[PDB]
Amino acid sequence: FGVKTEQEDVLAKELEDVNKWGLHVFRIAELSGNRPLTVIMHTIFQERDLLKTFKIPVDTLITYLMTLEDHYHADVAYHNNIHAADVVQSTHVLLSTPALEAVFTDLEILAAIFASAIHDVDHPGVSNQFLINTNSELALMYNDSSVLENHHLAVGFKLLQEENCDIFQNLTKKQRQSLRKMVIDIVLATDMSKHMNLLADLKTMVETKKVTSSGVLLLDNYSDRIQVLQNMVHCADLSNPTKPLQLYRQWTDRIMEEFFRQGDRERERGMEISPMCDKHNASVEKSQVGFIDYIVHPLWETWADLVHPDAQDILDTLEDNREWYQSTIPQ
Ligand SMILES: O=c1c2cccnc2n(-c2cccc([N+](=O)[O-])c2)c(=O)n1Cc1ccncc1
Ligand SMILES: [Mg+2]
Ligand SMILES: [Zn+2]
Numbered sequence: 001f002g003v004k005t006e007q008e009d010v011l012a013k014e015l016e017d018v019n020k021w022g023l024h025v026f027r028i029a030e031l032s033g034n035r036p037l038t039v040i041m042h043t044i045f046q047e048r049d050l051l052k053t054f055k056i057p058v059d060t061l062i063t064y065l066m067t068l069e070d071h072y073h074a075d076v077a078y079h080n081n082i083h084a085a086d087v088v089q090s091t092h093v094l095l096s097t098p099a100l101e102a103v104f105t106d107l108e109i110l111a112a113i114f115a116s117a118i119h120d121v122d123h124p125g126v127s128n129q130f131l132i133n134t135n136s137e138l139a140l141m142y143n144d145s146s147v148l149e150n151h152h153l154a155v156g157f158k159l160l161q162e163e164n165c166d167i168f169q170n171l172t173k174k175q176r177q178s179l180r181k182m183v184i185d186i187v188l189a190t191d192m193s194k195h196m197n198l199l200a201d202l203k204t205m206v207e208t209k210k211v212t213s214s215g216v217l218l219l220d221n222y223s224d225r226i227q228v229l230q231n232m233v234h235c236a237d238l239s240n241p242t243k244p245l246q247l248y249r250q251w252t253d254r255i256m257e258e259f260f261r262q263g264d265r266e267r268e269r270g271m272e273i274s275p276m277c278d279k280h281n282a283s284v285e286k287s288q289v290g291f292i293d294y295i296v297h298p299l300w301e302t303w304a305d306l307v308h309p310d311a312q313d314i315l316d317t318l319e320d321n322r323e324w325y326q327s328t329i330p331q
Helices: 006-017 026-032 036-047 058-070 081-095 106-118 128-133 139-143 149-161 171-186 192-207 223-236 245-271 284-306 311-325
Strands: none
Touching: 006 026, 026 036, 026 081, 026 245, 026 311, 036 058, 036 081, 036 106, 058 149, 081 106, 081 139, 081 171, 081 223, 106 149, 106 171, 106 223, 128 139, 128 245, 139 149, 149 171, 171 223, 192 223, 192 284, 223 284, 245 284, 245 311, 284 311
């Protein structure tokens, strides 16, 4: 016809909030026919002019994106395509913070967004330790070391080889080598076993924080640049408690569903039930307050310092949600 369907128009209107924290990502998932990752990535690529800059054919991008999304598991409650789309969109917002204006190149931006899109692809909904303890083929391949995170990368890159999926076909070898290194460095840093070290180095960076009069951040070497990009995507990955409570509670329900399912599998197998995975011995409210106090608030407070005052509202929202859960603990 040449004109959008009414569902497509309603989807387009929702996507006008692509640059805002708290996008209605679950509504977009529904309106797009469970294509949140494809539609959100396409919108962001168009907005940042990445198709023109990197000479990506539009049909190749849509084909690759649909293929990537298809390799997230629809049966997995949390680590699915909706989570991927959320992490992409959250990274997209963080990249555009005033404190980071003109800091990153288009290739570095491409790296952060692509890494976000692929960072949990083909997740089975169980932890690295579950895969290790069962002597899974994946664990054997990857020597029990960042098993899932290595796999997410291998799959994200492998899918480029499917029919009309090589979205990097026009990049030079130099551009591809740089992009690849950045993407690998970012996704391997999403392993939660790397969190404390990652946070340690972010703190040190804030301690030595340098800024150019009219104060955008100053980053002079790859180590500093990649460190900020790694922590940015890690912040996006751990951004659920910083969103409006209506969104945050949906994510909590999903991750508890996934965790309890793993616990049920551990129980039926005679394995010890992993932390937070026992549906018969859970303290959801207590656990969220602990999660925030020990992991999420320390990370985000440090990020907020790096980009001060850009992240004040995000940090305020986190603190409100923390107090809500705290007030909800049965004594
Ligand atoms: O993003 C969230 C997450 C997001 C929303 C709600 N809860 C989350 N929790 C969570 C769940 C139960 C208990 C605790 N705890 O610290 O005691 C944390 C989590 O660990 N992450 C990070 C994470 C996500 C996926 N796999 C492992 C860790
Ligand atoms: Mg992960
Ligand atoms: Zn993730």
